[PDB]
Design a binder for this molecule. Structure first.
Ligand SMILES: Cc1cc2nc3c(=O)[nH]c(=O)nc-3n(C[C@H](O)[C@H](O)[C@H](O)COP(=O)(O)OP(=O)(O)OC[C@H]3O[C@@H](n4cnc5c(N)ncnc54)[C@H](O)[C@@H]3O)c2cc1C
Ligand SMILES: NC(=O)c1ccc[n+]([C@@H]2O[C@H](COP(=O)([O-])OP(=O)(O)OC[C@H]3O[C@@H](n4cnc5c(N)ncnc54)[C@H](OP(=O)(O)O)[C@@H]3O)[C@@H](O)[C@H]2O)c1
Length: 529
């Protein structure tokens, strides 16, 4: 009666595993869609200079295919964007995935049918499809947050947002400006500084960055990893972050200053943001005195690398909370270069943009041939609201989430039956591929349980969703996060919203949580026959 058992939106990490698991392991008839012309998700769209993974190469991948784990290329310690794209293309090749992906096809609307209990999916070309279940693997790539700057539309030079980075960009002889110093801006600035006539960095808020330590991987090291891949993945599932770290329980202020400086320095040499934050000590994100110790080590490193003390001052975070640092391949070193200028657009904001320059509040005209906007995106739920998703009683996801996202286990939304989110909001804070695998296998097991027991409508209750929001709030309020403003709580509603964007108990406890549900006849889920 319906076109498919399941429809998947997205052909990235999440969508490709959702397709493989439902079609080949559970034998469902499924069609996937993506606006892209190729698989990859964020790794097909984000081809900006310096794009690099946050987790090491041997862990930023799938674990469910052992043959592929052995054949995988481990070139450098972290993996660049074109290599992630080539890997995901290889996954699609090996498992015959593309024949059930409709490319160059965006989904405009998905309407649930409380009669007959399936979903009505319309593409932007007015193609209509029906399916019992809807799998949303949308990521967080929509939509580009561009700087709201007076006159930015009059700029006659090259203007790119890092998410829409065009090929064939050349840098020599050009005066280039970069707005934004987050992870993307740090990666772009570090990669292009040596290639331009002059680089201006327009930073609104300095952030802490630690070295990434991206080194080439020896053939012995690669063989060492593959020989022990089963234990490596077992460590991922029994950890909180899934980054292959020895997650410390050691209190920061329980060692001498000599010892503390040695522990921070060892992680600094090795590289890695989460390593510096969670392999050194166990309370950096929970205790303020511990946090200040981590910051002071990075501030000290900034003041040593950056030789001009006034540029180092400008680069030093004033916030006072190292609530997750970035990673870089030589970011602070860039600012010793004679062709790099740092503009504190907090104490000197960009007021307007003319045809050939960026004007700051001090009147200075910063002449530019190129303006790179590394300015971020919408919130996590932004990708969901940009689709017309109507569930029970015809309520839209825009309205149900007008105050921020909320869900059950990060995978189910009340008033939206038969819809299952992959890497959606209210999920765990950990490495993405292990999270995506955990969710795809749990969702497929639920769909298989429904195909047997002949149930055709699965729905989370308002109580369970609120129980999940409580659990996240209880855990997140134990930490320093929010107070550093990391946009994990985005609430502020008169009757308290406390929409908690992340479950922060770790990947191991997250698998514990959703296992309680699956074991206990899916408590919190409305089953209908
Ligand atoms: C440079 C970079 C490095 C990163 N490194 C790490 C890391 O080391 N560790 C980590 O955990 N995370 C990392 N991330 C985060 C990253 O988003 C996740 O790791 C992962 O790629 C998310 O995969 P996904 O399939 O869930 O979403 P995506 O890769 O974003 O795929 C979403 C796809 O759904 C499509 N789509 C959306 N909406 C619609 C619609 N209405 N119709 C049709 N199609 C649609 C999109 O076009 C997109 O192709 C990194 C991100 C970037 C940009
Ligand atoms: N794993 C990785 O290595 C990696 C790589 C890329 C992205 N990500 C993730 O994907 C998300 C996006 O990363 P992102 O770096 O592109 O965006 P981002 O983290 O949100 O940072 C955006 C930067 O642009 C600045 N900015 C925004 N609007 C501005 C304005 N109007 N004027 C001046 N400055 C402005 C911001 O300054 P303010 O802070 O002052 O607002 C900020 O420094 C992040 O959450 C990140 O975790 C991860």
């Amino acid at each position: 009666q319906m076109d498919f058992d399941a429809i998947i939106i997205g052909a990235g990490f999440g969508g490709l595993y959702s397709l493989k698991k439902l079609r080949d392991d559970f034998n469902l008839k499924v069609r996937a869609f993506d606006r892209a012309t190729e698989v990859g998700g964020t790794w097909f769209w984000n081809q900006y200079p310096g794009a690099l993974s946050d987790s090491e190469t041997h862990l930023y991948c799938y674990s469910w295919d052992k043959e592929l784990l052995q054949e995988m290329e481990i070139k450098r310690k972290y993996i660049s964007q074109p290599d992630v794209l080539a890997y995901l293309k290889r996954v699609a090749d090996k498992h015959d995935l593309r024949k059930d992906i409709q490319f160059e096809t965006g989904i405009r609307s998905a309407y649930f049918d409380e009669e007959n209990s399936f979903w009505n999916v319309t593409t932007e070309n007015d193609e209509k499809f029906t399916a019992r279940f809807l799998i949303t693997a949308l990521g967080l790539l929509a939509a580009p947050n561009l700087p709201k700057i007076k006159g930015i539309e009059t700029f006659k030079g090259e203007l790119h947002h890092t998410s829409r980075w065009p090929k064939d960009v050349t840098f020599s002889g050009k005066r280039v400006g970069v707005i934004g110093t987050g992870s993307t801006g740090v990666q772009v600035i570090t990669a292009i500084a040596s290639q331009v006539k002059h680089l201006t960095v327009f930073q609104r808020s300095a952030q802490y960055s630690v070295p990434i330590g991206n080194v080439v991987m020896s053939e012995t090291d690669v063989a060492k990893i593959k020989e022990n891949y089963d234990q490596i993945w077992e460590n991922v599932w029994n950890s909180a972050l899934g980054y292959g770290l020895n997650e410390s329980t050691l209190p920061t202020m329980s060692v001498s200053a000599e010892e503390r400086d040695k522990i921070f320095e060892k992680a600094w040499q090795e590289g890695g943001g989460f390593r510096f934050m969670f392999e050194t000590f166990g309370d950096i994100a929970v205790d303020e005195t511990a946090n200040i110790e981590a910051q002071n080590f990075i501030k000290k490193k900034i003041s040593e690398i950056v030789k001009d003390p006034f540029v180092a001052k400008k680069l030093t975070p004033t916030d006072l909370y190292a609530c997750r640092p970035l990673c870089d391949s030589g970011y602070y070193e860039i600012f010793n270069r004679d062709n790099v200028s740092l503009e504190d657009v907090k104490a000197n904001p960009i007021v307007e943009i003319k045809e050939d320059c960026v004007v700051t509040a001090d009147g200075v005209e910063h002449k530019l041939d190129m303006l790179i906007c590394a300015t971020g995106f919408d919130a996590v739920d932004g990708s969901y609201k940009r689709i017309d998703i109507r569930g029970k009683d015809g309520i839209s996801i825009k309205d149900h989430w007008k105050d921020g996202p909320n869900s059950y286990l990060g995978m189910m939304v009340s008033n939206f039956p038969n819809m299952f989110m992959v890497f959606g909001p209210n999920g765990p804070l950990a490495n993405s591929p292990p999270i995506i695998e955990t969710q795809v296998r749990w969702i497929a097991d639920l769909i298989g349980y429904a195909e047997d027991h002949q149930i055709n409508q699965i729905e989370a209750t308002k109580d369970a969703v609120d129980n999940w929001t409580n659990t996240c709030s209880d855990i997140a309020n134990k930490t320093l996060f929010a107070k550093a403003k990391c946009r994990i709580f985005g609430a502020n509603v008169p009757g308290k919203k406390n929409t908690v964007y992340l479950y922060m108990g770790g990947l191991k406890e997250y698998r514990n949580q959703i296992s309680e549900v699956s074991n206990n006849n899916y408590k919190g889920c409305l089953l209908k026959q």
